[PDB]
Design a protein around this ligand. Structure first.
Ligand SMILES: Nc1ncnc2c1ncn2[C@@H]1O[C@H](COP(=O)(O)OP(=O)(O)OP(O)(O)=S)[C@@H](O)[C@H]1O
Ligand SMILES: Nc1ncnc2c1ncn2[C@@H]1O[C@H](COP(=O)(O)OP(=O)(O)OP(O)(O)=S)[C@@H](O)[C@H]1O
Ligand SMILES: Nc1ncnc2c1ncn2[C@@H]1O[C@H](COP(=O)(O)OP(=O)(O)OP(O)(O)=S)[C@@H](O)[C@H]1O
Ligand SMILES: Nc1ncnc2c1ncn2[C@@H]1O[C@H](COP(=O)(O)OP(=O)(O)O)[C@@H](O)[C@H]1O
Ligand SMILES: [Mg+2]
Ligand SMILES: [Mg+2]
Ligand SMILES: [Mg+2]
Lengths: 339, 328, 174, 348, 643
């Protein structure tokens, strides 16, 4: 119940004298103001303008701009004087079971509009968190009231939506932003905000974000206000990510020295930096395909690190798994080095 | 009626935790402004992160409002994060008016001390990020972990990060001597040093084992036998017998050795831990160390999975025996 | 519950064979004057694994979106990982080329495809791939092992590349 | 009431072995703030006898007057599950591992009932009700996390006494709080003395060498030794020097299966061993026990070179069995791989 | 506010690890340049039939075979021939005492076959003979009591009898508990007042609406009295209350158990309880006579179902209904309903089978039962498809769909019928040439071991569709397993996954099919050289044949490769011996079984051995001499042998 007023005035809430919310500073307004996914937005606008709008399924990684996009579509489709009478938005915050489908959804989809005649819109944020039986009712509500109203389901994981609910809709994936067209946003914000940053900072910003603007701006303002300068070292310190030099030294110890000295040095650096074995495995995996290895060596290393990353999940002793990670390289590539 | 030892002699306020210099300094600076930011403590267990955050909560609030204004929660709940989020929502929704007679009114924000934050999947981590953003100016979050790399980018970027380097052996030996003289327990240095050794640099396990020993053998000295059998540590004579049995190359005495270990009620995980700790710090070749360590990792995965102890130890000792006797 | 199954007659419905979905797709197309090529037919049948509802919805979506039925438009609307890319994955792994296979999979991963539909598409292409029976069996076994690893909760690039390495090494090891 | 139950000690001073352990337990309960007790040791070492002894030393004599009650509770998937429980007014003992992977309800809601019952009951003796979860090693990880948060939450109302044969499947935050009670299997002379005391209390006079043979055949399992002594008492009134120790009947079935596999190497014999293993599995004997028995039986016939390979094969397929669901696939596939290894070994 | 979230680290000067540099070794400085150039997909078009089973040619005229079957009514001679054929198939069945009854029952229909062939008399029931005679004797005694009461009333104007006022009937689903109750009531003219779970049955409603059914007479005693008032709220005939599915209690049924306990106490008329839950015999507190319906014999019910087929003028075989009964766990209701649906659809396959022990046989019921006819052509047979070599894409898809349809039920199809499906001889249980023969046996054993290794891989390291041991533990355990279905209207609200069900089903089906194809092909190429060994004079076929039980040869295919009646008698044995008073407190379960049960069996076998020796009588009295109250039937079961 409720829970919309807190967000509704949480978005326009700031100190406006000291706080600097750089994520909330730059927000899209309409379809022409979201400079990304131009094919999807032009397709949706063409569907709207021909009155041939089908049931939409907006899915993808979070922060890519699904909810703001469908809010822009709803505001352009219906004016402000009839927004509340024609648009029904629900999230997973108002979860009371499967009665949400039989409650507001079934009552709203089974009646006409009140004031001005037209087709209504239903927006369902976080539809994958909905249970299987509630979705099995939502597909029937969709099937029998498709002419009067259309449904737009926003989800993060496509696999958690049943095949029938997918098959009643057309699917649109909000893919990650290619780093190129992402970089102009970063240079615009640094040129506006007067921040000292090198190109290694831009590489780190486009690497940790992996195609988003929200966490990118979060990392950028956090590193800027914590240090005053934005570089590779300061970003990976503020984020607390595995530093590239540290992973390079780890690989050097596993690739040059004997078992015991490498083990002691790695354990000392792990307790010095608080660095887990899962992130070591991920970054070493990224490192393996860049360092020129033979095919058999690359295959053996990838198999062993996949096995270790599986063993770490069930909750064994990470000390033994770390020593086995060292063993995975000592078996092949140090033998070849000795050869 | 009484309390366990670990929560009894923890420091009452800030600046009483030794061996830390800048963490307590920044904590005192934040407390003097009466505004604690979102805090992240990472370090190995038994270092004082929980003690530091509890001391900060006691310092900023009043002791009668200390328990009412903090909420301790763990992230390893079996029902997903829905129950955790509903508990955080219930705690943040409820507001308790407070008054301090010491002269400083209580700050409005509430404290959620969340432990084992590094055992958290990325979806749950993003849900916690949006939960913290929902209560940014009403509840300041505390995250306790050993590994900061497991926490994903947004929560790690928005939290004040503090590293806790584990204490040295001399410092924890002195603290355990203070505990022993405070609780009237007859103690030799050798017992406290052996307690430090078997706790593996964790003060919490050392304090727990000391309290367990002084309650198991009341009004008596604390020998090494009780500490060994309470900490679960395998005797070194057993480990050397295992090593000699594998070096012999005979399977029958190997079977006899593991049957003796199993029938003595010795845990297979502890035997694997001690076997690995002896193997990696010996004069074995790197190939032998590599194969033995790979088999140790596979067997430990099998044990955490829940396979049979006797068969797993038989297989690990057979691999060790073949690797050692291959050179012979 | 078992009492209703005792009180009823249990009729079993199977997945529609691709010939049937093709015939009814052709019926709908000839009744709706849809311009098409055979590549679009194969793409629609691929995107709807024995699901007439999904095939009809995808066909209507691409005809309403682009107006012509070929493979490119269908995979622009359905937005699956492209089966030619996954076929080139499997073909490189048959030749035990870990470098090109991981190149294409890094391309797939950087496009935003999740682990779940990536391994699903790998299994779906690998089921009808042209190779030997024993290599198909070992490929299916390793794909299923990696898929249960994705199911249990561990889902990173490392597991995907590890499956790639295992599939490559199944060829170079007797 | 057999000799394993009629003559079971109920006082801490009656335990002839582990006297230092018994004195330590008594001194611990004299303090009155004993923690959760994780008690481990092999089966037949006496863990159940020790926990009944510390229960009797803890509470009054009313812990002998026990009752049997069935509790039925609702799954989160909305299904009703029933489970037996041996309980008393002073303590409650519930096996939680009978619910498959749904042990988390029998961990959590049952502890809720004990907490509300302790809040309702008052006797001015002690401020906790002992909850005994026998066989805690077989609990799932999810159930053990639920167990951990319940001991964190319910510690001031109830005290937990966990009994297991191993702390391998036990997650480490559980062991970080429970007091460890390692009860090793008692030695050969301890079994001989216990058998002598039991036979003297039954009016019989057994020799020392028969008791030593019984202690050596029992493999340091006191309950098996007592039951075999009872069966030998059934066989002959006097304890003769040529008293045949009553061998376990499914054990000699397993030995005959071992002779069946080692004798002939053909898929027909493989199917016959499969049928015998199905017959042995239908007797509700847990699969790891047949795994260990098969290993111990076939390791007599192999040479020293094959033993390590057969051992690693057995451990690998035992782990596959524990991960799997139907034990028959993993077990019989071990039979098949051993059969192939044996056939390719005796051909050269 | 936006205060500084400073990463504070206790970075002391030194330690040689805080401020590190990239390595100077040439391996880690030779970074390969990343390439993003993949092949272009616009040039390569997806050809038809690439990722699917699309073929240019299409079959026409082979399918869409309408049946239009007009079955001629059987004459007396052919019917009598079928009667003698079934009598020779089942020599232990009294087939003459039932055929006038079903012929009278049969003599444009609007009835289900469950009610069309409803048994009017309890003697017309099949199986559970002791139970129905117990019920009939109890109700006859209640009729005698009612007639005696009427005689006493007309004249006016109980430990020795031990007539308890209630029978509680328990058994599996659809064995005919309600059929037995109704048949007895119509045979002796009782009047049933039924309380179902479909009705609102709360305590105040049931007492205020049905107490005077027991406490008083019937106003209508002559005429229409064989009619059944189903209680609901929005010769003389005697009342009889019946509670159908007593174990089903909702939150709306407030205080139902206390109400039927008041009915227990204050009745003067018979009260009958019917439930399929075995645990309700323990939970309910009251005095009642217990009647247990066992699972009926497979051959008797199979003969009765063949018989129902005959009276509808179709002939058939016994084995197909045997496997049909096996698939339904001998459920008579499910089998009768599916038989009605199957017979009234005109039949599946017209194949003639001349048997003496004539129209054409109608075998193929279990194939359509599992939906295998929707996968295969009507010309194709299951075992014919499985024995021959699979080469085409459509045969592969048919194999995968068959295995998938068997994988959702968690049933291993190729595993259970592995003997009858491998290209090897199967028989019922009752020198360089030798080197080559042993090599052939070795190759066959290697193929079998490889296949069973993949099967172990499939169970262990592949996801199953339905999560095994979800509510109980694994099979063959005596903890529990009586997991009754849900009883509350609240929804599950679970967070289970859906994708990893049909994904894992396809994965397991494909892997099982490929592994079995590899194994069968290896066995085939191994025995392709068997002709050379046969020419050499040495025949290893004694070492290659498969010995399988007689009960598994009575079916076309099995869903299980073990014996479940064996497991049922075992589980009954451990549950009955370890429910005795003294041994009811052994808590360590695994220890309890493997220590107490074999020693108890040794004690029982030794006791029988001393009793066969004509020794003293007191040697029988060790079990009673230690106050070990074990019933004699289980002691005799324990004293036989170990299987
Ligand atoms: N393409 C984009 N370019 C720039 N900023 C964007 C873009 N998409 C999203 N944003 C930012 O994200 C804010 C809201 O995006 P959302 O719609 O919440 O993202 P999302 O794809 O819906 O994923 P969620 O909401 O976290 S599940 C906007 O106000 C922007 O600040
Ligand atoms: N430097 C220190 N100064 C004072 N007390 C300390 C110090 N290090 C450890 N302790 C004590 O050691 C005990 C255990 O430490 P805790 O803070 O409770 O746990 P921890 O160090 O956070 O490790 P965890 O919680 O298992 S990750 C407490 O009683 C602390 O007071
Ligand atoms: N032994 C039997 N002999 C003949 N017909 C039977 C037999 N058992 C069941 N039937 C048929 O099955 C129909 C329904 O049986 P029921 O008695 O309703 O099953 P049930 O014992 O009540 O089990 P439930 O109610 O499903 S739990 C009857 O009307 C008969 O047609
Ligand atoms: N001190 C003792 N003296 C004589 N018998 C004992 C003693 N301790 C244990 N026993 C016997 O040994 C058996 C061990 O079984 P149990 O108590 O279940 O241990 P576990 O739980 O380890 O199997 C018990 O039946 C008990 O009768
Ligand atoms: Mg959104
Ligand atoms: Mg803590
Ligand atoms: Mg019924």
């Amino acid at each position: 119940m409720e829970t919309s007023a807190l967000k509704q005035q949480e978005q326009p809430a700031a100190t406006k004298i000291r706080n600097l919310p750089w994520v909330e500073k730059y927000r899209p307004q309409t379809l022409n103001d979201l400079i990304s996914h131009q094919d999807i937005l032009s397709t949706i606008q063409k569907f709207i303008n021909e009155d041939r709008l089908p049931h939409l399924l907006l899915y993808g990684p979070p922060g890519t701009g699904k909810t703001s996009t469908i809010l822009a579509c709803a505001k352009q489709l219906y004016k402000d004087k009839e927004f509340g009478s024609m648009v029904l938005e629900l999230n997973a915050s108002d979860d009371r079971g499967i009665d949400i489908i039989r409650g507001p959804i079934l009552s709203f989809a089974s009646t006409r509009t009140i004031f001005k005649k037209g087709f209504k819109l239903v927006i369902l944020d976080e539809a994958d968190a909905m249970t299987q039986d509630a979705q099995n009712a939502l597909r029937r509500v969709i099937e029998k009231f498709t002419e009067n109203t259309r449904f737009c389901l926003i989800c993060n994981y496509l696999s958690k939506i049943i095949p029938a609910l997918q098959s009643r809709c057309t699917r649109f994936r909000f893919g990650p932003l290619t780093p190129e067209l992402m970089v102009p946003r970063l240079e615009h914000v640094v040129e506006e905000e007067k921040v000292d940053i090198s190109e290694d900072g831009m590489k780190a910003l486009v690497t940790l974000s992996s195609g988003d603007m929200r966490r990118a701006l979060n990392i950028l303002q956090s590193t800027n206000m914590a240090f005053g300068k934005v570089t590779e070292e300061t970003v990976y310190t503020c984020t607390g990510h595995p530093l590239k030099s540290d992973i390079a030294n780890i690989l050097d110890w596993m690739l040059n020295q004997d078992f015991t000295t490498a083990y002691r040095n790695i354990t000392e650096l792990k307790t010095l930096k608080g660095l887990a074995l899962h992130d070591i495995l991920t970054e070493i995996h990224l490192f393996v395909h860049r360092v020129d290895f033979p095919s058999s060596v690359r295959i053996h290393l990838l198999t062993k690190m996949a096995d270790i990353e599986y063993r770490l999940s069930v909750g064994t002793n990470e000390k033994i798994q770390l020593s086995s990670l060292i063993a995975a390289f000592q078996v092949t590539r140090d033998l070849i080095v000795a050869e | 009626k009484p309390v366990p030892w670990v929560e009894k002699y923890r420091p009452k306020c800030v600046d009483e935790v030794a061996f830390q210099e800048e963490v307590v300094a920044v904590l005192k600076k934040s407390l003097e402004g009466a505004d604690l930011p979102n805090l992240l403590f990472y370090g190995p267990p038994g270092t004082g992160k929980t003690s530091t955050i509890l001391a900060a909560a006691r310092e900023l609030f009043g002791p009668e409002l200390f328990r009412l204004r903090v909420l301790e929660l763990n992230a390893s709940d079996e029902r997903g994060i829905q129950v955790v989020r509903e508990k955080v929502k219930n705690f943040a929704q409820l507001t308790v008016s407070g008054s301090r007679s010491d002269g400083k009114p209580c700050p409005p924000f509430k404290i959620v001390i969340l432990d084992e934050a590094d055992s958290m999947t990325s979806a749950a981590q993003a849900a916690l990020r949006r939960t913290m953003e929902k209560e940014s100016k009403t509840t300041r979050f505390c995250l306790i972990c050993n590994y900061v790399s497991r926490i994903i980018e947004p929560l790690t970027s928005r939290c004040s990060k503090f590293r806790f380097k584990p204490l040295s052996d001399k410092i924890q030996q002195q603290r355990l001597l203070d505990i022993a003289k405070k609780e009237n327990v007859k103690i030799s240095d050798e017992g406290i040093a052996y307690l430090v050794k078997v706790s593996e640099g964790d003060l919490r396990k050392a304090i727990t084992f000391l309290q367990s020993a002084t309650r198991l053998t009341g009004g008596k000295e604390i020998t090494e036998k009780v500490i060994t059998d309470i900490a679960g540590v395998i005797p070194a004579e057993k480990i050397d017998g295992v090593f000699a049995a594998c070096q012999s190359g005979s399977f029958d005495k190997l079977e006899a050795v593991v049957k003796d270990l199993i029938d003595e009620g010795h845990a297979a995980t502890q035997l694997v831990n001690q076997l690995h700790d002896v193997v990696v710090e010996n004069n074995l070749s790197d190939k032998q160390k590599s194969i033995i360590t790979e088999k140790l990792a596979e067997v430990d995965k099998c044990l955490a999975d829940g396979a049979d102890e006797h068969l797993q130890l038989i297989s690990l000792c057979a691999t060790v025996m073949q690797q050692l006797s291959q050179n012979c | 519950i078992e009492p209703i199954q005792s009180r009823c007659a249990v009729l079993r419905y199977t997945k529609l064979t691709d010939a049937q979905i093709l015939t009814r797709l052709m019926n709908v197309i000839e009744k709706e004057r849809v311009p098409y090529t055979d590549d679009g037919l194969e793409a629609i049948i691929f995107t709807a694994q024995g699901d007439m509802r999904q095939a009809l919805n995808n066909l209507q979506s691409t005809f309403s979106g682009f107006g012509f039925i070929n493979s490119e438009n269908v995979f622009k609307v359905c937005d699956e990982p492209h089966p030619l890319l996954v076929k080139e994955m499997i073909q490189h792994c048959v030749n035990a080329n870990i470098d090109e296979a991981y190149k294409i999979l890094a391309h797939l991963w950087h496009l935003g495809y999740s682990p779940e539909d990536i391994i699903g598409n790998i299994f779906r292409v690998c089921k009808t791939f042209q190779m030997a029976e024993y290599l198909k069996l070992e490929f299916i076994k390793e794909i299923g092992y990696t898929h249960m690893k994705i199911a249990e909760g561990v889902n990173s690039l490392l597991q995907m590349a590890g499956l790639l390495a295992r599939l490559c090494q199944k060829t170079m090891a007797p | 009431s057999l000799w394993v139950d009629k003559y079971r000690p109920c006082s801490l001073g009656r335990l002839d072995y582990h006297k230092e352990q018994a004195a330590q337990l008594r001194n611990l309960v004299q303090c009155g703030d004993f923690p959760h007790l994780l008690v481990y040791g092999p089966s037949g070492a006496g863990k159940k006898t020790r926990i009944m002894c510390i229960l009797r030393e803890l509470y009054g004599v009313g812990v002998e007057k026990l009752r049997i009650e069935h509790q039925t509770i609702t799954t989160p998937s909305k299904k009703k599950i029933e489970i037996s429980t041996i309980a008393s007014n002073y303590h409650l003992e519930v096996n939680p591992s009978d619910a498959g992977n749904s042990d988390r309800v029998v961990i959590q809601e049952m502890l809720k009932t004990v907490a509300q019952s302790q809040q309702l009951e008052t006797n001015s003796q002690r401020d906790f009700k002992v909850v005994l979860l026998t066989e805690v090693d077989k609990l799932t990880k999810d159930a053990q996390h639920a167990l951990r948060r319940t001991m964190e939450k319910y510690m001031s109302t109830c005290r937990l006494i966990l009994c297991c044969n191993s702390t391998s499947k036990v997650i480490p935050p559980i062991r970080s709080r429970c007091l460890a009670v390692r009860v090793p299997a008692p030695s050969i002379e301890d079994i001989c003395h216990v058998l002598s005391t039991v036979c003297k209390k039954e009016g019989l006079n057994l020799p020392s060498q028969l008791a030593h043979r019984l202690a050596e055949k029992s493999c340091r399992n006191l309950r098996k030794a007592l039951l075999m002594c009872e069966a030998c008492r059934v066989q002959q009134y006097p304890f003769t020097a040529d008293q045949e120790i009553p061998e376990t009947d499914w054990e000699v079935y397993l030995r005959e299966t071992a002779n069946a596999i080692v004798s002939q190497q053909t898929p027909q014999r493989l199917l016959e061993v499969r049928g015998r293993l199905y017959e042995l599995l239908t007797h509700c004997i847990p699969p790891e026990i047949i795994m260990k028995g098969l290993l111990s039986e076939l390791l007599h016939n192999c040479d020293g070179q094959l033993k390590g390979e057969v051992a690693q094969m057995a451990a690998y397929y035992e782990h596959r069995l524990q991960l799997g669901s139907k034990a028959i696939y993993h077990l019989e596939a071990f039979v098949a791989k051993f059969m192939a290894l044996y056939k390719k070994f005796m051909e050269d | 506010s936006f205060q500084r979230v400073v990463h504070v680290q206790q970075k002391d000067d030194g330690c040689c690890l805080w401020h590190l540099k990239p390595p100077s070794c040439p391996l880690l400085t030779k970074f390969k340049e990343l390439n993003t150039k993949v092949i272009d997909l616009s040039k390569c078009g997806i050809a038809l039939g690439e990722f699917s089973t699309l073929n240019s040619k299409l079959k026409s005229g082979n399918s869409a075979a309408v049946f239009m079957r007009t079955r001629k009514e059987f004459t007396e001679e052919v019917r009598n021939l079928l009667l003698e054929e079934i009598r020779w198939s089942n020599p232990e069945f009294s087939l003459k005492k039932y055929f006038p009854l079903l012929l009278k029952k049969q003599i444009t229909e609007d009835m289900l076959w469950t009610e069309k062939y409803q048994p009017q008399t309890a003697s017309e029931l099949i199986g559970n003979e002791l139970a129905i005679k117990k019920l009939h004797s109890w109700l006859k005694d209640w009729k005698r009591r009612a007639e005696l009461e009427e005689r006493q009333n007309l004249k006016g104007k109980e430990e020795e009898s031990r007539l308890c006022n209630t029978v509680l009937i328990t058994g599996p689903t659809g064995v005919g508990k309600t059929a037995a109750v109704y048949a007895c009531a119509q045979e002796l003219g009782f009047k049933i007042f039924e309380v179902n779970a479909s009705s609102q049955r709360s305590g105040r409603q049931i007492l205020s609406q049905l107490k005077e059914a027991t406490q008083s007479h019937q106003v209508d005693k002559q005429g229409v009295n064989s009619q059944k008032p189903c209680f609901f709220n929005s010769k003389n005939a005697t009342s009889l209350i019946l509670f159908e599915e007593v174990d089903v209690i909702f939150d709306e049924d407030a205080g139902f158990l206390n109400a039927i306990k008041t009915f227990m106490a204050t009745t003067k008329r018979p009260v009958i309880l019917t439930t399929s839950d075995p645990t309700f015999s323990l939970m309910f507190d009251g005095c009642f006579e217990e009647i247990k319906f066992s699972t009926p014999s497979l051959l008797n019910v199979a003969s009765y179902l063949q018989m129902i087929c005959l009276t509808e003028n179709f002939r058939t075989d016994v084995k197909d209904f045997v496997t049909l009964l096996t698939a339904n766990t001998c459920d008579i209701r499910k089998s009768i309903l599916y038989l009605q649906f199957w017979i009234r659809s005109g039949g599946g396959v017209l194949e003639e089978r001349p048997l003496t022990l004539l129209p054409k046989c109608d075998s193929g019921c279990a194939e359509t039962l599992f939906g295998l006819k929707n996968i295969f052509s009507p010309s194709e047979d299951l075992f014919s498809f499985l024995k021959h070599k699979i080469t085409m894409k459509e045969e592969w898809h048919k194999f995968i769909q068959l295995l998938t349809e068997f994988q959702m039920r968690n049933v291993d199809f190729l595993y259970s019928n592995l003997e009858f499906i491998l290209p090897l001889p199967v028989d019922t249980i009752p020198t360089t040439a030798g080197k080559k023969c042993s090599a052939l046996v070795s190759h066959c054993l290697n193929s079998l071991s490889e296949f069973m290794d993949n099967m172990s891989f499939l169970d262990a390291l592949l996801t199953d569709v339905r999560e095994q041991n979800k509510y109980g533990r694994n099979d063959f355990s005596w903890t529990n397993g009586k997991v009754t279905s849900g009883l509350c209207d609240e929804f599950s609200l679970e967070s289970n996954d859906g994708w990893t069900s049909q994904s894992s089903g396809e994965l397991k089906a494909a892997a099982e099919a490929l592994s079995f194809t590899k194994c069968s092909s290896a066995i085939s190429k191994a025995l392709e050289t068997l002709n050379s060994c046969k020419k050499l004079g040495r025949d290893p076929t004694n070492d290659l044949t498969f010995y399988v039980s007689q009960k598994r040869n009575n079916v076309y295919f099995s869903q299980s490769a073990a014996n479940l009646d064996n497991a049922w008698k075992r589980i009954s044995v451990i549950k009955s011996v370890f429910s005795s008073r003294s041994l009811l407190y052994v808590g360590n379960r695994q220890a309890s079984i493997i220590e107490y049960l074999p020693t108890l069996r040794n004690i029982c076998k030794t006791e029988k051995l001393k009793e066969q020796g004509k020794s003293k009588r007191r040697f029988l009295h060790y079990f009673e001499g230690i106050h070990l109250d074990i019933p004699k039937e289980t002691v005799n079961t324990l004293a036989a042998d170990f299987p």
